[PDB]
Amino acid sequence: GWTGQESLSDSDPEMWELLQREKDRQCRGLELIASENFCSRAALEALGSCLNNKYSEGYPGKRYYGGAEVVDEIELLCQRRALEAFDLDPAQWGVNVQPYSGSPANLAVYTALLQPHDRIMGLDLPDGGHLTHGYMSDVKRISATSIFFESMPYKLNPKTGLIDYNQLALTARLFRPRLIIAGTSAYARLIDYARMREVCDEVKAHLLADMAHISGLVAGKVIPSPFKHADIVTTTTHKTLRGARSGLIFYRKGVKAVDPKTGREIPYTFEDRINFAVFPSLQGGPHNHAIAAVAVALKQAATPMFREYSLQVLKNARAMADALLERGYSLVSGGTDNHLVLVDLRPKGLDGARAERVLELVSITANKNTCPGDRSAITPGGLRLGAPALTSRQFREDDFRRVVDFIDEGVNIGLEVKSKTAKLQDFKSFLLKDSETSQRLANLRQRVEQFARAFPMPGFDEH
Amino acid sequence: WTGQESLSDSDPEMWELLQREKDRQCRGLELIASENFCSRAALEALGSCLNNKYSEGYPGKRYYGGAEVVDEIELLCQRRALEAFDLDPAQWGVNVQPYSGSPANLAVYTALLQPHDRIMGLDLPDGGHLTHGYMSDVKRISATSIFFESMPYGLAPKTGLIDYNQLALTARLFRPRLIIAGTSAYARLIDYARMREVCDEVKAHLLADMAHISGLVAAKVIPSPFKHADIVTTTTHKTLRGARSGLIFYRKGVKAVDPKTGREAPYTFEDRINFAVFPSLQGGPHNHAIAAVAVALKQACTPMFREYSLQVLKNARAMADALLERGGYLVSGGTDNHLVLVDLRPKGGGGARAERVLELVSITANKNTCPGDRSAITPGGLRLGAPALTSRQFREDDFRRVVDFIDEGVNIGLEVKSKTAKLQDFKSFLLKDSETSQRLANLRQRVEQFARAFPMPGFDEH
Ligand SMILES: CC1(C)[C@@H](OC(=O)CCC(=O)O)CC[C@@]2(C)[C@@H]1CC[C@]1(C)[C@@H]2C(=O)C=C2[C@@H]3C[C@@](C)(C(=O)O)CC[C@]3(C)CC[C@]21C
Ligand SMILES: CC1(C)[C@@H](OC(=O)CCC(=O)O)CC[C@@]2(C)[C@@H]1CC[C@]1(C)[C@@H]2C(=O)C=C2[C@@H]3C[C@@](C)(C(=O)O)CC[C@]3(C)CC[C@]21C
């Protein structure tokens, strides 16, 4: 008779088989999705805890709901570990740990700082921006950021460091936006630019750094911090931070600067505004399980171990980069200085959508990527590859050297099938039905999986 | 570093806190209609490798590879949801991605309205929850009141019951595009068939946020909004006893035709609601939450859980009866659902004194505005629910001692309230006075050991 202390294995075999298939697919796969990581077991033990059951609407100091005695201390702990993880000064920075995920963390900042229809700029979606930074199609508002607010994108300058900081400054003086976002998905270069904070300081905009993709790197000081230049920072606690899926908003606090007469030094106004956008306005009850798992990860990230990881992540990225040039690929202007690598595949003779589907069938998971020349729409000429997921499975430069030989056999199987096919589902069908290709893919799949299965995997053994 | 080390080993500080929260839960009595203790099965999924998987999109329409397995978990959760409530796949869909309750609501508004379009959500004191629409007399509070234009409630004051009259009058005036049949603190059924007239009148949309009653409806004990409503939202916690997540149910397929028009006239909810959740508001789904949600929906699609929902109402009824024979007055006269809103006005006790006393006694219920009320920091009534304790196998008898335990709370309160000045001066006197602090510790021990023996869902030690 139902106790609810039963195991998932006993009460829901259907779900336990599926957890187990997912676990096998991760262990046997080569995961190159720049935004994927494998979460620590420690973190998942918190994530899947009794903190699920506690409603704690409000914030630590006094948050009136009730018993929150212990969760208050978890939230403060998470706060302290957050500010420790990236460089201290609690005198000069605050943090909100309650955002449900990344998109909520951004919509919170917009909501706290701007009025509906206020003007926002971010790197356009195709040029490697996030959806939540704003995106309108020809005839549709697509991001909620573009619906509740007025978004104009700053494009990428095809071949250079790409982020046209020029065209930005030109258009940000014509558009008079009250917040500009500095953050990217598909970009191999450094930003979180002190020059964003000039373009901003100029036209009286707020600088928001969305560092979700590089947060681990920043956490580790293996790349330079947006927290010197930017006044608001948002991140996810997964990706390069390697925690559970949650979000963070960091904001400046205390006295901003001093000005005419004896002074009366002007105070920052973010803290209370961002905390009101998060709890009363947008979110109900925080997910205390996520907050705890986030706390576990942030401590992991404030350690010798995590600095070694993030250095290995850059060297692994460079390795995979150097390796692809060696066989003459083309990387979106140059190479990389971060966690990922954008391959241009038009000069090697294949698009992204074919390359992605071929690698998919050999247990290599990357994403197709629009290259500056946005024909776009599921047939872009690039491929986005990242090192963090595998670097967490103890891969080194030789391991990525070999990952790239497997991608090579993939690209090469593609070209071949691209020479007997009618572009669309006549390609995708041909990979299923053709006895010669179906076999050549199985053989490559089996080599990847044997290669993949041998490396350790964070998490539990079986789920 | 492997990332396979146990949390005990790698973070004792966090492991101690998980463990103190575990102590705290199994210890006390939880009567908050919005709270419940999650199954081990469900938590096993919540804390799985599904946390590791990005699957932006919907099953079949993904933007990444390597979703073969997550597709099936999402569809399973879909199916378990339509089955859980009973619901014909021809005539209903579900979206299982919402991160929580507030997102599920904002997603419906975003899919169905333009910014500044008009929303009638039962006001905060008359039922409530922020996400229905709430401005103070100085400022917009809920983001629903910022991005959309919200006009409050319609209840016959004192008479807890829903003014189906002045609503219909004002829904003919204010001309709102969507009305929210749903409640935080309301012990009665919402006439959904009469909402569907008020709404079919105004050419409005009917939304039910059935967060606290979600279990009951699947369980077929209460009448489902899913006969009258077009859109239904819920959290997967509370009454459903699952992980913190959110669901959005919506009608699909044909809506009948006029004689000559032929027969073409299909629902347009699905694509719009799904597009408001993925490109529009949310990034990647929390596949771990979806999995955990799926566990709970089955745990619940079953014989076992129809006798949870049957015991929940009768547990509620029992509590209701045993406060009419003592505790105070019954805002509504009684209950017909998972909770009772007792008035402490005719008992001469605020809602905020009575809440904070039971807190120090490890019983957590809710402060609740009642129609005879002042709007200051404290004043109102008391909101009780059967889902939490009903989960630790409590029956009607459990719910006579729990009520006698609350009586000792009410009664040490009244005593405190006759030797103290304001609330500030009241809640001081509970902490300071050696005579009262010991009288309270002795009641805390009686409720503690009444529950602490009882079984609780979860991992024993987190
Ligand atoms: C008077 C005001 C309008 C005002 O008062 C200020 O805060 C002034 C501060 C300032 O000057 O900035 C602004 C917000 C607020 C303080 C109150 C309204 C009532 C609460 C208290 C407001 C709040 O924030 C949070 C909630 C929550 C909603 C609830 C019941 C749920 O929805 O479940 C969960 C519990 C909780 C906390 C109680 C009820 C309200 C709606
Ligand atoms: C408008 C939509 C939502 C929609 O397309 C349309 O509706 C167009 C209108 C029409 O069809 O007419 C669906 C397909 C899509 C083309 C675009 C924009 C969103 C991207 C581009 C979609 C896509 O395929 C792949 C991703 C990826 C996710 C991301 C950011 C990551 O997760 O890191 C990695 C980079 C990348 C490429 C950026 C953003 C999206 C989600």
Side-chain angles (χ1 to χ4, degrees), chain A, chain B residues 1-90 92-202 204-462:
Chain A
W2 190 87
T3 158
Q5 292 196 110
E6 296 149 64
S7 77
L8 182 58
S9 189
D10 295 318
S11 19
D12 204 329
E14 204 157 356
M15 189 59 49
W16 182 249
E17 288 324 316
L18 277 165
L19 288 204
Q20 290 213 291
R21 265 217 269 147
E22 178 54 17
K23 191 60 197 193
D24 198 72
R25 190 205 54 82
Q26 292 178 21
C27 292
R28 80 193 186 243
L30 281 189
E31 182 65 283
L32 294 158
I33 293 290
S35 65
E36 291 273 42
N37 217 335
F38 301 107
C39 189
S40 91
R41 181 212 179 162
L44 296 187
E45 275 193 284
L47 186 54
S49 81
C50 58
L51 297 185
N52 184 76
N53 314 294
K54 179 76 286 205
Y55 254 104
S56 62
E57 299 195 296
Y59 294 72
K62 244 51 164 168
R63 62 131 56 72
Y64 207 90
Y65 219 129
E69 281 226 305
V70 62
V71 286
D72 159 343
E73 217 184 306
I74 287 169
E75 194 156 347
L76 275 189
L77 184 37
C78 192
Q79 280 175 24
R80 210 189 343 300
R81 290 177 174 182
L83 305 168
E84 153 76 340
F86 306 88
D87 229 329
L88 222 102
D89 220 36
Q92 154 133 47
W93 288 94
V95 69
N96 187 305
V97 306
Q98 293 198 29
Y100 290 141
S101 214
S103 311
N106 283 343
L107 184 54
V109 163
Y110 309 153
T111 309
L113 295 195
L114 303 199
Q115 288 300 316
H117 314 296
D118 280 1
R119 269 158 198 206
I120 271 155
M121 296 166 105
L123 186 76
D124 208 31
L125 191 31
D127 295 347
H130 197 259
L131 253 167
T132 71
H133 301 177
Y135 181 69
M136 277 151 43
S137 81
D138 281 359
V139 71
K140 183 155 205 176
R141 292 147 190 288
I142 278 163
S143 184
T145 287
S146 298
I147 289 162
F148 303 138
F149 313 94
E150 288 306 297
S151 68
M152 211 190 32
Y154 58 88
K155 298 272 176 168
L156 208 67
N157 163 23
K159 279 313 168 22
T160 35
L162 304 219
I163 277 180
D164 203 330
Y165 129 125
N166 296 347
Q167 212 195 232
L168 183 46
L170 200 163
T171 62
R173 271 160 191 139
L174 288 197
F175 184 78
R176 303 285 313 161
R178 17 246 328 312
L179 174 141
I180 309 200
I181 299 139
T184 78
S185 335
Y187 191 69
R189 304 299 189 173
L190 292 66
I191 40 145
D192 309 31
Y193 295 155
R195 50 246 131 274
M196 298 291 285
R197 190 43 182 289
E198 285 166 33
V199 174
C200 280
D201 270 348
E202 173 166 323
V203 309
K204 311 268 109 291
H206 283 304
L207 183 57
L208 163 64
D210 181 15
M211 54 159 185
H213 262 253
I214 70 186
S215 36
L217 312 199
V218 182
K221 294 130 193 291
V222 316
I223 77 172
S225 200
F227 287 77
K228 304 217 213 163
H229 307 297
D231 23 9
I232 323 297
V233 203
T234 54
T235 179
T236 57
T237 55
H238 52 299
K239 322 180 210 251
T240 55
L241 256 174
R242 202 161 62 174
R245 277 168 192 272
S246 173
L248 297 182
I249 302 165
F250 301 87
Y251 47 86
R252 301 254 240 220
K253 60 149 56 138
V255 285
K256 167 172 214 255
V258 72
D259 256 289
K261 211 45 164 160
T262 290
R264 219 130 338 296
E265 51 196 40
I266 293 193
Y268 277 117
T269 42
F270 296 140
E271 187 160 337
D272 333 70
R273 232 124 53 89
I274 285 162
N275 282 6
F276 197 96
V278 177
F279 165 44
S281 294
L282 284 154
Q283 297 194 175
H287 291 186
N288 296 301
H289 48 293
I291 298 174
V294 162
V296 169
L298 286 169
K299 187 179 27 50
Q300 290 175 186
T303 70
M305 178 276 289
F306 195 82
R307 190 139 172 13
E308 277 273 294
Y309 170 60
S310 301
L311 251 139
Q312 190 60 51
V313 163
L314 294 171
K315 297 194 238 122
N316 275 173
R318 273 196 186 276
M320 168 163 41
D322 295 342
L324 286 149
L325 286 173
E326 279 184 301
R327 343 211 178 184
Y329 267 109
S330 297
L331 319 175
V332 159
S333 303
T336 162
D337 311 286
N338 71 27
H339 73 284
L340 82 126
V341 162
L342 317 168
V343 155
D344 188 352
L345 277 192
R346 297 161 310 171
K348 208 97 174 56
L350 237 205
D351 61 11
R354 290 181 256 267
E356 190 179 58
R357 179 61 172 148
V358 151
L359 304 176
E360 192 181 344
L361 295 170
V362 293
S363 311
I364 315 190
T365 51
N367 53 267
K368 63 202 172 270
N369 196 131
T370 282
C371 286
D374 333 33
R375 171 272 117 65
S376 202
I378 302 67
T379 154
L383 201 67
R384 185 184 94 149
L385 316 173
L390 289 172
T391 307
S392 293
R393 298 200 63 201
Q394 284 174 23
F395 277 49
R396 304 240 216 87
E397 295 91 342
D398 296 14
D399 306 293
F400 271 90
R401 226 104 57 197
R402 176 81 159 290
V403 163
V404 176
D405 309 3
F406 287 129
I407 289 144
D408 210 31
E409 312 192 25
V411 160
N412 287 186
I413 285 184
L415 299 172
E416 287 186 321
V417 319
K418 202 200 181 187
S419 301
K420 21 176 68 156
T421 56
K423 175 125 188 151
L424 284 87
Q425 215 229 2
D426 273 357
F427 179 112
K428 271 218 264 145
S429 265
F430 177 71
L431 290 184
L432 281 280
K433 253 36 217 141
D434 194 63
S435 186
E436 199 196 276
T437 309
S438 133
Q439 276 194 295
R440 196 155 50 215
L441 290 180
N443 175 288
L444 178 44
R445 197 177 146 163
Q446 186 54 39
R447 279 183 282 125
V448 171
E449 285 183 17
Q450 285 161 195
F451 175 63
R453 275 186 193 281
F455 299 83
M457 177 58 93
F460 304 108
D461 313 342
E462 70 279 287
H463 76 293
Chain B
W1 177 89
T2 65
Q4 304 203 245
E5 302 89 343
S6 82
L7 185 56
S8 257
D9 260 275
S10 22
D11 190 3
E13 196 177 4
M14 191 58 62
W15 182 252
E16 285 173 39
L17 276 158
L18 260 192
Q19 284 235 239
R20 212 198 304 168
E21 172 53 29
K22 193 55 193 199
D23 223 330
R24 181 217 89 67
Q25 262 158 108
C26 281
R27 224 133 70 151
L29 290 182
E30 260 63 342
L31 279 197
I32 301 179
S34 302
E35 252 205 5
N36 208 343
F37 313 84
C38 192
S39 94
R40 169 157 175 245
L43 289 203
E44 280 189 306
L46 194 51
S48 68
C49 57
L50 291 177
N51 181 84
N52 294 340
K53 188 41 178 147
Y54 253 102
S55 59
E56 281 163 343
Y58 290 107
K61 322 310 130 207
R62 298 292 187 199
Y63 296 124
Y64 302 115
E68 39 270 38
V69 180
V70 290
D71 280 350
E72 277 169 20
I73 290 167
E74 188 165 353
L75 292 172
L76 186 40
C77 202
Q78 280 180 4
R79 267 135 37 193
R80 288 187 175 182
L82 290 191
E83 287 176 59
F85 290 89
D86 197 358
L87 271 144
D88 202 288
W92 287 89
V94 70
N95 186 300
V96 306
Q97 288 190 38
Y99 296 134
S100 218
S102 314
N105 285 350
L106 185 45
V108 166
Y109 314 151
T110 312
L112 293 198
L113 313 182
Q114 297 317 263
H116 307 306
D117 283 6
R118 318 253 230 200
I119 275 162
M120 295 202 71
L122 201 72
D123 207 51
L124 199 30
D126 299 38
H129 202 32
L130 281 171
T131 77
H132 288 110
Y134 184 73
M135 340 190 179
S136 79
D137 282 355
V138 216
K139 100 192 237 155
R140 322 206 166 214
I141 299 297
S142 176
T144 51
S145 293
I146 290 189
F147 302 134
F148 304 100
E149 291 292 322
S150 59
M151 218 202 347
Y153 47 98
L155 216 84
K158 171 96 191 240
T159 312
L161 252 258
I162 309 116
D163 176 45
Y164 273 89
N165 316 105
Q166 156 229 243
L167 199 98
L169 191 105
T170 65
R172 224 117 50 191
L173 293 194
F174 182 85
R175 264 334 234 58
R177 305 256 314 129
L178 177 127
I179 319 209
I180 305 138
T183 82
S184 209
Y186 188 68
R188 243 65 218 219
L189 276 58
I190 302 154
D191 183 350
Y192 308 107
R194 182 84 191 110
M195 293 315 210
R196 191 42 178 274
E197 285 181 39
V198 171
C199 291
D200 272 1
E201 169 86 322
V202 170
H205 284 311
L206 179 53
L207 168 55
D209 172 22
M210 45 126 156
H212 298 239
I213 81 163
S214 32
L216 293 105
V217 177
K220 287 152 177 310
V221 323
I222 258 85
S224 83
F226 297 70
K227 218 273 151 178
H228 306 308
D230 15 23
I231 325 297
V232 201
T233 52
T234 178
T235 56
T236 53
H237 46 300
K238 317 159 183 150
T239 157
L240 259 187
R241 199 160 40 172
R244 292 175 188 285
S245 171
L247 303 170
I248 300 162
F249 298 93
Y250 49 87
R251 293 258 14 204
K252 116 208 219 142
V254 308
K255 319 163 53 166
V257 77
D258 134 288
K260 201 54 172 281
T261 295
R263 28 224 282 160
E264 43 252 55
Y267 278 114
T268 37
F269 291 132
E270 175 144 80
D271 299 2
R272 289 193 267 162
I273 293 254
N274 281 337
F275 205 97
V277 177
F278 171 41
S280 294
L281 281 149
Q282 297 200 171
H286 296 188
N287 296 307
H288 51 291
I290 296 175
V293 158
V295 170
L297 287 175
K298 200 126 208 268
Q299 172 197 271
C301 196
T302 67
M304 174 271 157
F305 193 78
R306 199 228 181 203
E307 216 280 321
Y308 183 74
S309 308
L310 281 167
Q311 105 255 305
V312 159
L313 290 174
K314 291 197 309 206
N315 287 322
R317 225 57 129 167
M319 180 150 42
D321 296 336
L323 299 150
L324 303 152
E325 324 209 273
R326 259 309 193 283
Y329 147 58
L330 223 304
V331 192
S332 61
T335 300
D336 233 67
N337 77 23
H338 91 273
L339 57 64
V340 200
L341 351 156
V342 139
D343 209 333
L344 34 276
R345 198 194 92 265
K347 196 97 204 201
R353 344 185 145 290
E355 187 183 38
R356 162 63 153 159
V357 137
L358 298 169
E359 267 150 38
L360 335 146
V361 163
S362 308
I363 153 70
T364 61
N366 257 166
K367 42 169 69 106
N368 181 198
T369 318
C370 292
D373 263 41
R374 338 86 258 168
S375 219
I377 308 93
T378 145
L382 207 63
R383 178 232 232 76
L384 318 143
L389 260 16
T390 296
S391 83
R392 313 181 80 167
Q393 304 282 209
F394 287 38
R395 313 196 149 213
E396 291 90 351
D397 286 345
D398 299 77
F399 278 75
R400 267 131 216 176
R401 20 282 206 189
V402 300
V403 165
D404 279 2
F405 287 121
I406 148 196
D407 247 322
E408 326 205 41
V410 128
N411 274 315
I412 119 278
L414 298 170
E415 289 218 55
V416 167
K417 188 193 186 249
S418 63
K419 244 61 64 65
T420 55
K422 334 130 125 49
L423 236 311
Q424 145 56 355
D425 287 346
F426 179 105
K427 300 185 154 150
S428 282
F429 173 94
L430 298 188
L431 276 43
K432 310 321 193 283
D433 193 62
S434 266
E435 185 170 73
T436 310
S437 60
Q438 281 18 122
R439 271 189 58 217
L440 239 46
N442 272 285
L443 166 55
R444 187 152 194 280
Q445 233 80 341
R446 255 148 23 235
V447 341
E448 256 209 3
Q449 274 61 248
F450 172 58
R452 176 150 166 156
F454 279 89
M456 196 188 125
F459 286 86
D460 298 4
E461 70 193 357
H462 67 325

Short mmCIF file of all heavy atoms in Angstrom, two decimals, chain B residues 321-338:
data_model
loop_
_atom_site.label_atom_id
_atom_site.label_comp_id
_atom_site.label_asym_id
_atom_site.label_seq_id
_atom_site.Cartn_x
_atom_site.Cartn_y
_atom_site.Cartn_z
N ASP B 321 -16.02 20.28 9.45
CA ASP B 321 -16.96 19.85 10.53
C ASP B 321 -16.35 20.15 11.91
O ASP B 321 -17.04 20.76 12.73
CB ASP B 321 -17.35 18.38 10.39
CG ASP B 321 -18.14 18.07 9.13
OD1 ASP B 321 -18.78 19.00 8.58
OD2 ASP B 321 -18.08 16.89 8.70
N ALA B 322 -15.07 19.83 12.13
CA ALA B 322 -14.41 19.90 13.46
C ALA B 322 -13.89 21.32 13.77
O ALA B 322 -13.18 21.49 14.77
CB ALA B 322 -13.31 18.84 13.57
N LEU B 323 -14.16 22.29 12.92
CA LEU B 323 -13.89 23.73 13.23
C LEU B 323 -15.21 24.53 13.40
O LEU B 323 -15.17 25.59 14.10
CB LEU B 323 -13.00 24.27 12.12
CG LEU B 323 -11.66 23.56 11.99
CD1 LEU B 323 -11.17 23.57 10.54
CD2 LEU B 323 -10.66 24.22 12.93
N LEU B 324 -16.31 24.07 12.76
CA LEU B 324 -17.73 24.47 13.01
C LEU B 324 -18.15 24.05 14.45
O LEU B 324 -18.91 24.80 15.15
CB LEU B 324 -18.64 23.86 11.91
CG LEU B 324 -18.30 24.21 10.44
CD1 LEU B 324 -18.75 23.10 9.49
CD2 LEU B 324 -18.92 25.53 9.98
N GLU B 325 -17.61 22.91 14.92
CA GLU B 325 -17.64 22.45 16.35
C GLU B 325 -16.37 22.93 17.09
O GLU B 325 -15.63 22.07 17.62
CB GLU B 325 -17.75 20.92 16.36
CG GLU B 325 -18.61 20.37 15.24
CD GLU B 325 -19.34 19.06 15.51
OE1 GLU B 325 -18.72 17.99 15.27
OE2 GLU B 325 -20.52 19.14 15.95
N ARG B 326 -16.09 24.26 17.08
CA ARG B 326 -14.93 24.91 17.77
C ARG B 326 -14.30 26.01 16.90
O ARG B 326 -14.90 27.10 16.89
CB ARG B 326 -13.83 23.93 18.19
CG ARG B 326 -13.87 23.55 19.66
CD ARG B 326 -13.94 24.76 20.59
NE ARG B 326 -13.66 24.42 21.99
CZ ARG B 326 -14.50 23.81 22.84
NH1 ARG B 326 -15.73 23.47 22.47
NH2 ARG B 326 -14.11 23.55 24.08
N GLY B 327 -13.20 25.70 16.17
CA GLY B 327 -12.11 26.58 15.68
C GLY B 327 -12.49 28.03 15.37
O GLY B 327 -11.68 28.93 15.72
N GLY B 328 -13.64 28.27 14.71
CA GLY B 328 -14.18 29.61 14.38
C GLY B 328 -15.28 29.55 13.31
O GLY B 328 -15.91 28.46 13.20
N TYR B 329 -15.48 30.65 12.54
CA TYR B 329 -16.45 30.78 11.40
C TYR B 329 -15.77 30.33 10.08
O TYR B 329 -14.49 30.40 9.94
CB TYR B 329 -17.11 32.18 11.38
CG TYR B 329 -17.47 32.81 10.04
CD1 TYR B 329 -18.33 32.18 9.13
CD2 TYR B 329 -17.01 34.08 9.68
CE1 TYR B 329 -18.66 32.76 7.91
CE2 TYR B 329 -17.32 34.66 8.46
CZ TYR B 329 -18.15 34.00 7.57
OH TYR B 329 -18.46 34.57 6.38
N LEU B 330 -16.61 29.83 9.14
CA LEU B 330 -16.22 29.17 7.87
C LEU B 330 -16.58 30.06 6.66
O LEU B 330 -17.62 29.90 6.04
CB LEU B 330 -16.89 27.80 7.83
CG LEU B 330 -16.00 26.67 7.33
CD1 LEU B 330 -15.45 27.00 5.95
CD2 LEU B 330 -14.89 26.43 8.32
N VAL B 331 -15.65 30.93 6.29
CA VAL B 331 -15.73 31.82 5.10
C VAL B 331 -16.18 30.84 4.04
O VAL B 331 -15.45 29.91 3.81
CB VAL B 331 -14.35 32.45 4.85
CG1 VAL B 331 -14.45 33.58 3.83
CG2 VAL B 331 -13.67 32.90 6.14
N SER B 332 -17.37 31.01 3.46
CA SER B 332 -18.06 30.05 2.56
C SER B 332 -19.15 29.14 3.19
O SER B 332 -19.95 28.56 2.40
CB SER B 332 -17.01 29.23 1.79
OG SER B 332 -16.15 28.46 2.65
N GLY B 333 -19.17 28.98 4.52
CA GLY B 333 -20.11 28.10 5.28
C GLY B 333 -19.60 26.66 5.47
O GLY B 333 -20.19 25.91 6.28
N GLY B 334 -18.53 26.29 4.77
CA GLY B 334 -18.06 24.90 4.62
C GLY B 334 -17.06 24.81 3.48
O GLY B 334 -16.55 25.89 3.05
N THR B 335 -16.79 23.60 3.01
CA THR B 335 -15.88 23.30 1.86
C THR B 335 -16.63 22.42 0.87
O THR B 335 -17.56 21.74 1.33
CB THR B 335 -14.63 22.55 2.31
OG1 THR B 335 -13.95 23.37 3.26
CG2 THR B 335 -13.72 22.20 1.16
N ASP B 336 -16.23 22.40 -0.40
CA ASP B 336 -16.62 21.30 -1.34
C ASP B 336 -15.36 20.78 -2.04
O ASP B 336 -15.50 19.94 -2.91
CB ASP B 336 -17.73 21.72 -2.33
CG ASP B 336 -18.94 20.79 -2.35
OD1 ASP B 336 -19.66 20.73 -1.32
OD2 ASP B 336 -19.16 20.09 -3.37
N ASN B 337 -14.18 21.24 -1.62
CA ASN B 337 -12.87 20.95 -2.27
C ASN B 337 -11.78 20.85 -1.19
O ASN B 337 -12.12 20.88 0.02
CB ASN B 337 -12.47 22.14 -3.16
CG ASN B 337 -11.91 23.36 -2.45
OD1 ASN B 337 -11.40 23.29 -1.33
ND2 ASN B 337 -11.96 24.51 -3.11
N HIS B 338 -10.51 20.67 -1.63
CA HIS B 338 -9.32 20.28 -0.82
C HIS B 338 -8.99 21.13 0.42
O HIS B 338 -8.00 20.88 1.10
CB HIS B 338 -8.12 20.23 -1.80
CG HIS B 338 -7.40 21.53 -1.88
ND1 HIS B 338 -7.81 22.53 -2.76
CD2 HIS B 338 -6.38 22.06 -1.16
CE1 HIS B 338 -7.04 23.59 -2.60
NE2 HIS B 338 -6.15 23.33 -1.63
#
